[PDB]
Ligand binder design. Structure first.
Ligand SMILES: [K+]
Ligand SMILES: [Sm+3]
Ligand SMILES: [Sm+3]
Ligand SMILES: [Sm+3]
Ligand SMILES: [Sm+3]
Length: 341
DNA sequence: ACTCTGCCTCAAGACGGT
DNA sequence: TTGAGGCAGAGT
DNA sequence: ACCGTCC
């Protein structure tokens, strides 16, 4: 994401953050970063440190989360479209090499904690090694089809396509925890949208327009600010944190100008800094064409959903069947059948 | 006093019966 | 993966 | 709401 962004917004842009009750969202459409939500289920949904799985050893945590949460959203008249990641931008290569480095380190550690039967430390490294795979994505897509819930494949970053869907008015907001979605220009970001039966946190909306107003920036300058906070796509300036980045952006407006003014002895810039390229990425990312697919929420295929979730994945038939009935009735309540003229 | 860095730990879901 | 925080200790 | 269990 962008290091410190959420906090910075709370501290110096408090009014960009609006809370509303789940009841106010009846009828609203939202774009969800599917990979991130899958990740949250893999990580969270363990029984005895082990994922849920069917008897043939296949993981089912992601299916559990994405079946039941999606239905809860629909019960509240919230209509989600799931967006899946595509090929990462080249600028991300450095950051990805870093990740694989940590994954390598985590693999080593896992192995040892195993030898020393450190079952508690083994659970640590296992979690750290959690990875959303292509099979996880394909299985969720399959599930969503059966559920009648639309999904889209982004050409590159999913959060950029979510942003694009919001700007185009195809959904109300991008539901994600990753603030770089705002950096990609999303007018609205919603966090904590799970529609939990036992809500723990309130539904939050971040309005880009309020953010730009409070900080007194335009979007170019806001992207430059985020770049200075620290993004996945290039280096930041050592010694320049949230407090100073804000001051410098407000004073100088652009990173180029910030370079021309910084004392190169005190604040040397990264070597061959790619800020200009990352700036370009955030403002003009590769995104799907939001005029291309028409989002629709369709009738759930009950019998196939039972064969897949129950027959193959070994979910309780009563729960699944009950889930499908609720989903079907809730769609009926929030959705108009197609009309021809 | 204020800022930042680098180091640490920690959580992260949902259902049904009670 | 995304946050959340805390710590000392060094820089401004 | 708590908590054993889910697959
Ligand atoms: K920095
Ligand atoms: Sm991101
Ligand atoms: Sm992404
Ligand atoms: Sm089978
Ligand atoms: Sm199988």
């Amino acid at each position: 994401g962008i290091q410190g962004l959420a906090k910075l917004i709370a501290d110096v842009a408090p009014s960009a953050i609006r809370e509303n009750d789940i009841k106010s969202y009846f009828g609203r459409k939202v774009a969800i970063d599917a990979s991130m939500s899958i990740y949250q289920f893999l990580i969270a949904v363990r029984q005895g440190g082990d994922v849920l799985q069917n008897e043939e050893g296949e993981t089912t945590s992601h299916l559990m989360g994405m079946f039941y949460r999606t239905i809860r959203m629909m019960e509240n008249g919230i209509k989600p479209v799931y967006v899946f990641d595509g090929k990462p931008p080249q600028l991300k290569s450095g950051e990805l090499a870093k990740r694989s480095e940590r994954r390598a380190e985590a693999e080593k550690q896992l192995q040892q904690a195993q030898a020393a039967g450190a079952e508690q430390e083994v659970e640590k490294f296992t979690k750290r090694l959690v990875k959303v795979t292509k099979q996880h994505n394909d299985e969720c897509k399959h599930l969503l089809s059966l559920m009648g819930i639309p999904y889209l494949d982004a050409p590159s970053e999913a959060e950029a396509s979510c942003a694009a869907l919001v700007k185009a008015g195809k959904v109300y907001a991008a539901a994600t925890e990753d603030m770089d979605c705002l950096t990609f220009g999303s007018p609205v970001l919603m966090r904590h949208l799970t529609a939990s039966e036992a809500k723990k946190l309130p539904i939050q909306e971040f309005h880009l327009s309020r953010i730009l107003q409070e900080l007194g920036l335009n979007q170019e300058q806001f992207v430059d600010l985020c770049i200075l906070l620290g993004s996945d796509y290039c280096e930041s300036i050592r010694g320049i944190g949230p407090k100073r980045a804000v001051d410098l952006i407000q004073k100088h407006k652009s990173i180029e100008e910030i370079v021309r003014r910084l004392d190169p002895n005190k604040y040397p810039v990264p070597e061959n800094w790619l800020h200009k390229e990352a700036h370009q990425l955030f403002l003009e990312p590769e995104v799907l064409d939001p005029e291309s697919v028409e989002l629709k929420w369709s009738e759930p295929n009950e019998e196939e959903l039972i064969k897949f979730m129950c027959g193959e994945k070994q979910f309780s038939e009563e729960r699944i069947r009950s889930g499908v009935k609720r989903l079907s009735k809730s769609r009926q309540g929030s959705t108009l059948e197609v009309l021809f003229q």
